[PDB]
């Protein structure tokens, strides 16, 4: 288990192994045992990640030889293990640079996430509670527009690759099948099944109306099943809060399943059956490809390096905040200067600028009013 940047540099004992991949991402609360690492150690049946052991977004991997499957864990600012490093560092070393900081990280994961959709078969996001964050309806809707822009660039970086034909046309192994994991959080504690089947009814309707789960399983960046689980809910457990476990034992000394939920999907990729998720008034054919370790890194490595990605990145929710902030400030510049010893009078108009409008960049736009007044007289 090492970073991906340190893995792509080279394999001989397992170069030829029909495998799968799993992308993990999402939000996580502030705790020692993250909901992502414990997800791996629970599936692999071992203690992979030992307990108690400029950029803030990274990704690491792990290869399970006993199951022929690889994992990828996106760790961006959304989590708290990395968000703390930012706030802490930002505490030692304004209203403008900050907007560029938080916005840069908001972009750094967006593209990092894209790289996960183009090289994964399956991928499951997490959320510490039920009631999935509706904000994803925009993230996935905006990210799609970004893929279509860089798609002609990524295929070139994998042109001279042994992946295949379908791969080179769409840059993905197959349209992934997204999943969902939700911690219970002390709620209800069958009841769960009634909840799982409800969220599915929601997510489908929420996304379907957004036109992100179209009929064609090729245009959509992530599919959803029709006759399967598609979601899981982690119930409470004494494993978390380890110190509280001993105290529960000390008092005694003195006096479906997760794997089965993820294996039913992996059994279809390893068996080469593929994901046939297209039931929108007429079925369609979805490509597929089961690569090998040495054959997968060939593309991911060339795809992990990719200025070109910045062309469509800077162009394609911090951006919307700068727009209303620039317009609200610009609109107030004319009503302020046009309505206007001089230090007392010029400062008087400045008092109206505060009540007129402001924004994340209003402190900079005010210079146009001050300079425009200082030049007058």
């Amino acid at each position: 288990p090492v970073s991906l940047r340190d893995l792509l540099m080279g394999e001989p004992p397992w170069r030829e192994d029909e495998i799968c991949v799993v992308g993990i991402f999402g939000k996580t609360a502030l705790r020692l045992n993250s909901e992502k690492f414990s997800l791996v150690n629970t599936v692999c049946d071992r203690q992979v990640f030992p307990l108690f052991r400029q950029d803030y977004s990274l990704l690491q991997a792990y290869y399970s030889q006993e199951s022929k499957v690889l994992y990828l864990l996106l760790t961006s600012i959304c989590d708290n293990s990395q968000l703390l490093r930012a706030c802490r560092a930002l505490q030692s070393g304004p209203h403008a640079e900050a907007h560029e900081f938080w916005k840069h990280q908001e972009k750094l994961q967006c593209l990092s996430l894209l790289y996960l959709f183009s090289v994964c078969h399956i991928l499951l996001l997490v959320h510490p509670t039920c009631s999935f964050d509706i904000t994803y309806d925009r993230v996935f809707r905006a990210l799609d527009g970004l893929r279509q822009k860089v798609l002609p660039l990524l295929k070139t970086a994998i042109k001279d690759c042994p992946v295949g034909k379908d791969w080179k046309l769409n840059c993905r192994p197959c349209p992934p099948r997204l999943l969902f994991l939700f911690q219970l959080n002390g709620a209800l504690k069958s009841p769960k099944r009634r909840l799982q089947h409800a969220l599915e009814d929601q997510i489908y309707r929420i996304f379907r109306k957004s036109r992100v789960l179209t009929n064609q399983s090729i245009n959509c960046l992530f599919t959803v099943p029709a006759n399967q689980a598609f979601v899981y809910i982690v119930p409470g457990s004494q494993e978390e809060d380890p110190v509280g476990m001993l105290l529960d034992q000390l008092r005694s000394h003195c006096t479906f399943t997760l794997r089965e939920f993820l294996w039913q999907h992996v059994e279809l990729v390893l068996s080469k059956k593929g994901f046939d998720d297209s039931v929108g008034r007429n079925p369609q054919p979805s490509h597929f490809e089961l690569p090998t370790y040495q054959k997968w890194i060939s593309a991911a490595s060339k795809l992990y390096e990719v200025s070109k990605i910045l062309s469509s990145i800077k162009v394609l929710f911090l951006d919307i905040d700068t727009k209303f902030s620039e317009n609200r400030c610009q609109k107030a510049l004319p009503m302020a200067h046009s309505a206007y010893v001089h230090k007392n009078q010029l400062a008087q108009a400045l008092r109206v600028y505060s009540q007129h409008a402001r924004g994340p960049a209003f402190h900079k736009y005010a210079m146009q009013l001050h300079e425009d007044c200082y030049k007058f007289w």
């Binding site: 939000k27 609360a29 502030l30 705790r31 020692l32 600012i77 959304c78 708290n80 968000l83 703390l84 930012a86 706030c87 802490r88 930002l90 505490q91 209203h95 900050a98 510490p128 509670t129 039920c130 009631s131 999935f132 964050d133 509706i134 904000t135 925009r138 959080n185 002390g186 709620a187 209800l188 009841p191 009634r194 909840l195 409800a198 969220l199 929601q202 929420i206 109306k209 957004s210 809060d241 110190v243 509280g244 105290l247 529960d248 008092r251 003195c254 006096t255 919307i320 905040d321 727009k323 209303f324 902030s325 317009n327 609200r328 505060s354 009540q355 409008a357 402001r358 924004g359 994340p360």
Partner: protein, 309 residues
């Protein structure tokens, strides 16, 4: 010198379809110096359950007697909301409360599918169209959460703090992390919160610090106030639950009865600044709210922000 009236259950100030209800002046008086308390939060955090325990209920009471109706297992098992708009209530001490419609609620959006850019953008407007109201007609605002650090919420408040109509009135704010666990009470983690909340709201302009210090309320007995660089207004609320053998377990945190009794005090003992520039009574406040509401729907900043999406 008889009394005015007595309220036993909440009423509705705003219809479920954004419409003002004038069925509340029959419970207000003409006196001044009133307190108002608003609430913001996600779907099932426990905001309707908190305003009740602070207004007139107690923990010993049953969930069926809360002035603000809470969630029932009939909906938790299928996903859903229970507030549906904005409520209203007054206590013996003449304190106003205002529960609210969830923020970024899928159940609301799910209901809209079965009934003007997109329903997603419309819902994104309602919240700001609500949050902007509370930030204009309230003294305190209780931001409830089920877990910790949901950036999608901190990056939402500023959007609301730059959408209201109109030195300027910036109300107070409170961060209440409901459903807290033992780990959330260790001081090594307590300081991490205050550090994160301050850096994420350093330029929020809201009053989120210098008040409601849970550190001096006897929660953490041996901690000196110099342990935190900036003690923001944050609070915690937990999850409700011969002699040696009968000892309880190490919960590791104060009882839900204690903490609630402390918040009921600190919130009731908050400041009561002047919203408008006229010493207004309890009745003129109502008329003022109607004036803001009519100025929030048919506004400019909201519509402009709507088109950007």
């Amino acid at each position: 010198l008889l009394p005015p009236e007595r309220m036993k259950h909440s009423i509705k100030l705003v219809d479920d379809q954004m419409n003002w209800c004038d069925s509340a002046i029959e419970y207000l008086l003409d006196q001044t110096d009133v307190l108002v308390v608003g609430v913001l939060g996600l779907q099932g955090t426990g905001k309707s359950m908190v305003m009740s325990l602070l207004s007139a209920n107690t923990p010993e009471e049953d969930q069926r007697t809360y002035v603000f109706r809470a969630q029932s297992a009939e909906m938790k098992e299928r996903g859903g909301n229970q507030t549906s708009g904005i409520d209203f209530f007054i206590t013996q001490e003449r304190i106003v409360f205002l529960d609210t419609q969830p923020i970024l609620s899928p159940s609301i959006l799910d209901h809209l599918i079965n009934n003007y850019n997109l329903p997603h953008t419309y819902v994104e407007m309602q919240s700001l169209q609500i949050a902007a109201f509370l930030f204009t007609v309230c003294h305190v605002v209780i931001v409830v959460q089920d877990w910790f650090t949901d950036l999608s919420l901190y990056r939402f408040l500023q959007t609301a703090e730059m959408v209201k109509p109109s030195t300027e009135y910036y109300p107070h704010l409170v961060f209440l992390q409901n459903k807290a666990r033992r780990e959330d009470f260790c001081p090594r983690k307590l300081r991490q919160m205050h550090l994160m909340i301050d850096q994420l709201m350093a330029h929020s302009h809201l009053r989120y610090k210098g008040t409601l210090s849970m550190l001096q309320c006897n929660v953490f007995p041996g901690l000196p106030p110099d342990f935190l660089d900036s003690e923001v207004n944050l609070f915690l609320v937990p999850f409700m639950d011969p002699l040696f053998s009968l000892l309880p377990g190490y919960r590791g945190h104060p009882s839900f009865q204690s903490l609630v009794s402390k918040l009921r005090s600190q919130v009731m003992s908050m400041a009561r600044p002047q919203l408008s520039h006229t010493i207004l009574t309890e009745k003129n406040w109502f008329h003022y709210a109607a004036r803001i509401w009519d100025g929030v729907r048919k506004s400019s900043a909201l519509a402009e922000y709507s088109r950007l999406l």
